[PDB]
Amino acid sequence: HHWGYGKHNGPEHWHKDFPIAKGERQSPVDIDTHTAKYDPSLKPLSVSYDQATSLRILNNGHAFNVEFDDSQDKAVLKGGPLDGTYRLIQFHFHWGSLDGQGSEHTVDKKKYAAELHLVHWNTKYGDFGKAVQQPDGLAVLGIFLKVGSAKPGLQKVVDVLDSIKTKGKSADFTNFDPRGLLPESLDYWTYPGSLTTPPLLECVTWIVLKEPISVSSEQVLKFRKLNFNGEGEPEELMVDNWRPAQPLKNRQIKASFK
Ligand SMILES: NS(=O)(=O)c1ccc(NC(=S)Nc2ccc(F)cc2)cc1
Numbered sequence: 001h002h003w004g005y006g007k008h009n010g011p012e013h014w015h016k017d018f019p020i021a022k023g024e025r026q027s028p029v030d031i032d033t034h035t036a037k038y039d040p041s042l043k044p045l046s047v048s049y050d051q052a053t054s055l056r057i058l059n060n061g062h063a064f065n066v067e068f069d070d071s072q073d074k075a076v077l078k079g080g081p082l083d084g085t086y087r088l089i090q091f092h093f094h095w096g097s098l099d100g101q102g103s104e105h106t107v108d109k110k111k112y113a114a115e116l117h118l119v120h121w122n123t124k125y126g127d128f129g130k131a132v133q134q135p136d137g138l139a140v141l142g143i144f145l146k147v148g149s150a151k152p153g154l155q156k157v158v159d160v161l162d163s164i165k166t167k168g169k170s171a172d173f174t175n176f177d178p179r180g181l182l183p184e185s186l187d188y189w190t191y192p193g194s195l196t197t198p199p200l201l202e203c204v205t206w207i208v209l210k211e212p213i214s215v216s217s218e219q220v221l222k223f224r225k226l227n228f229n230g231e232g233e234p235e236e237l238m239v240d241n242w243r244p245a246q247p248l249k250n251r252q253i254k255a256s257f258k
């Protein structure tokens with residue numbers, strides 16, 4: 001697999017190796033805020049990150065992932081649309097070459113500068129690899145980023161990026177608290193979807209927060225200094241690593257709020 005985000009290997013090409021790219025529950029999607037309906041059946045959302053144990057940060061050639069110890073129930077997501085318990089495994093971002101693009105989900109066609117994805121797997125399936133084969137295997141918490149004031153809780157991530165510039169580089173990243181990446185409100189939209197990168201598996205319950213977080217121009221500029229390429233290869237800046245909105249088809253987006 002040589003997929004990426006370029007003209008020659010980007011989202012318009014993915015279907016050839018991954019035919020589910022044209023499936024019935026692909027992500028991301030545009031969230032039409034007028035058509036999303038308030039759902040009183042949604043239980044309260046519970047984000048329990050007090051015991052989260054970060055381990056490492058990795059440039060995987062597509063984004064960077066902050067990885068967690070998921071060998072026990074240390075950082076979990078429950079409630080909302082979810083049945084049972086979902087364990088945090090990693091977070092990553094998608095972002096643009098400029099501040100007017102970068103998010104995967106859109107809100108009434110508005111694109112944000114970036115989007116954070118906190119990835120969790122359903123513990124009833126035992127491991128991540130088994131969970132991704134199930135329709136209710138993952139829950140991804142999506143948070144929009146807009147450019148304005150700096151996000152203090154992001155700065156530790158920004159400051160380590162110089163050490164993982166190129167594909168395959170990693171750095172120890174212990175003691176990072178993901179609580180510092182959340183907005184105040186947990187109001188959200190939810191719908192059934194997919195991974196937004198190959199293999200595009202239709203295993204995700206998406207939970208997209210309504211309230212963006214603010215980050216500074218300086219913070220996002222540092223994301224844009226990363227490289228898709230490996231060390232000693234021609235430089236290709238890691239920007240515009242987002243998939244565009246996909247057809248909603250036979251899905252409804254539910255709102256947790258009135
Ligand atoms: N952008 S996203 O939808 O949140 C997203 C979240 C997670 C992943 N894949 C990961 S962590 N590894 C993986 C490896 C082998 C598989 F067969 C399936 C997934 C991709 C996209």
Ligand SMILES: [Zn+2]
Nearest residue numbers: 092094117196
């Ligand atoms: Zn993602």
